[PDB]
Amino acid sequence: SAFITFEGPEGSGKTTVINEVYHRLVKDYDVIMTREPGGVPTGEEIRKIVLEGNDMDIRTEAMLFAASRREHLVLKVIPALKEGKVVLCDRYIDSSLAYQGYARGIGVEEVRALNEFAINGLYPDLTIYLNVSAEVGRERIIKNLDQEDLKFHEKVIEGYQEIIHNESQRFKSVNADQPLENVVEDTYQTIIKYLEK
Amino acid sequence: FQSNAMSAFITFEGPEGSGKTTVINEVYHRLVKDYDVIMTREPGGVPTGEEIRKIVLEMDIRTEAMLFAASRREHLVLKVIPALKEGKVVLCDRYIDSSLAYQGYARGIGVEEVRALNEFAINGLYPDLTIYLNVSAEVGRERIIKNRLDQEDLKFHEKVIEGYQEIIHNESQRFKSVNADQPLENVVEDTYQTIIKYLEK
Numbered sequence A: 001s002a003f004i005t006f007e008g009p010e011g012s013g014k015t016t017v018i019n020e021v022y023h024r025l026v027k028d029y030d031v032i033m034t035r036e037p038g039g040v041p042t043g044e045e046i047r048k049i050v051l052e053g054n055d056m057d058i059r060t061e062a063m064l065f066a067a068s069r070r071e072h073l074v075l076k077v078i079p080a081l082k083e084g085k086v087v088l089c090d091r092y093i094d095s096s097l098a099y100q101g102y103a104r105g106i107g108v109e110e111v112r113a114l115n116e117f118a119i120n121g122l123y124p125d126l127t128i129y130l131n132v133s134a135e136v137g138r139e140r141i142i143k144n145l146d147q148e149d150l151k152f153h154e155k156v157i158e159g160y161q162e163i164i165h166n167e168s169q170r171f172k173s174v175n176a177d178q179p180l181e182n183v184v185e186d187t188y189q190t191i192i193k194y195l196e197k
Numbered sequence B: 001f002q003s004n005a006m007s008a009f010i011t012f013e014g015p016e017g018s019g020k021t022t023v024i025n026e027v028y029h030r031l032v033k034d035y036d037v038i039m040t041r042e043p044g045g046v047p048t049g050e051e052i053r054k055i056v057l058e059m060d061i062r063t064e065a066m067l068f069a070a071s072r073r074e075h076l077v078l079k080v081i082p083a084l085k086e087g088k089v090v091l092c093d094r095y096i097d098s099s100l101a102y103q104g105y106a107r108g109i110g111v112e113e114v115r116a117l118n119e120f121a122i123n124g125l126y127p128d129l130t131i132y133l134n135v136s137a138e139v140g141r142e143r144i145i146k147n148r149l150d151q152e153d154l155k156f157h158e159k160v161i162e163g164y165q166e167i168i169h170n171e172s173q174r175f176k177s178v179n180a181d182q183p184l185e186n187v188v189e190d191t192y193q194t195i196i197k198y199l200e201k
């Protein structure tokens, strides 16, 4: 089995990348693709509170992300891993650390401790970071902007950079400024190498 | 002329059968005569707090603990803090100690893990005074039946009491215990007197 997470800011092509990498690995592995809350009804109900309310207190928001994360983890991810599957997960703890902890300003370590309660130490085996520049991301978002949005997008990237440096061992950064075909090939190759050793 | 407003965050804790509901209500009505007071309980009608609670009604123990903590934060920030800012005595039925006794100790998550989660939700805002309605398991048991219990319930009620006895020990900077084994008339009286002594300083 393998627990592989995918992280990135907006405009990194993460969605398409995970989907195209999934189809390729299917040939060689017993793999599944998922994203929190991933169909789990309880996780869905929690995420819906986050999707609907606005100007929501950022700590509350963080706790709700953590709660939906746990339900997804316990009801979908853990059972998949015990069956011996390769789980490709779109977003996990690093997303809360970068969005809620750094960019929103709650504090990365505070958000990390909340999330450790939710995941009880189950970190991914591998985390692919789709390293896109703020400018390329920006252009990708418009191709598919308000000033506040630009500043937040930059803070998210800045948060991901600081997070990557401290625990560089579990992360594998992929150059996501390249065209998507190449981002997919570099991601697939990174995953293939990890899985074969 | 325009007097100084003296706010206070007072919580009430106790297991089932402690008479807490009647106590907090009767105390409220006696205090309203002399103080600007409000009575609340989480989620307390705050929009998001109520949405979260409906999830805990319509699930893993850690998930439930995080949802109670998130409903607590909403109630604190959108209801309790504003009332304190306006000079009110806030009477609150349950708060962090309930999560420590029930989720932390009784459900077995760990009191310290649940305290840490809750400190993220409350950001260090502990009550000024907390009344613990100290009812013995047996008296509590008889009160619950009045208003038998299956084995699972009886055992859990005992474990919640054990948890509270551990959590309140050496917490006199905010905790005050009232003997909840006496008739309710007296429990209401002792509680009221405890609060007015606290508030008159």
Ligand SMILES: Cc1cn([C@H]2C[C@H](N=[N+]=[N-])[C@@H](COP(=O)(O)O)O2)c(=O)[nH]c1=O
Binding pocket: A009, A010, A011, A036, A065, A091, A092, A093, A095, A096, A097, A099, A100
């Ligand atoms: C999983 C997760 C998502 N989110 C947000 C970030 C995402 N925005 N981006 N850009 C948003 C929806 O994510 P996708 O764009 O990956 O579907 O949810 C968090 O803020 N915290 C979290 O922990």
Ligand SMILES: Cc1cn([C@H]2C[C@H](N=[N+]=[N-])[C@@H](COP(=O)(O)O)O2)c(=O)[nH]c1=O
Binding pocket: B016, B042, B068, B093, B094, B095, B098, B099, B102, B103
């Ligand atoms: C606020 C809170 C309530 N509860 C539970 C205990 C209470 N026991 N009952 N019976 C229940 C509803 O509260 P009342 O019984 O005080 O209405 O919710 C927790 O387990 N953790 C908490 O943080």
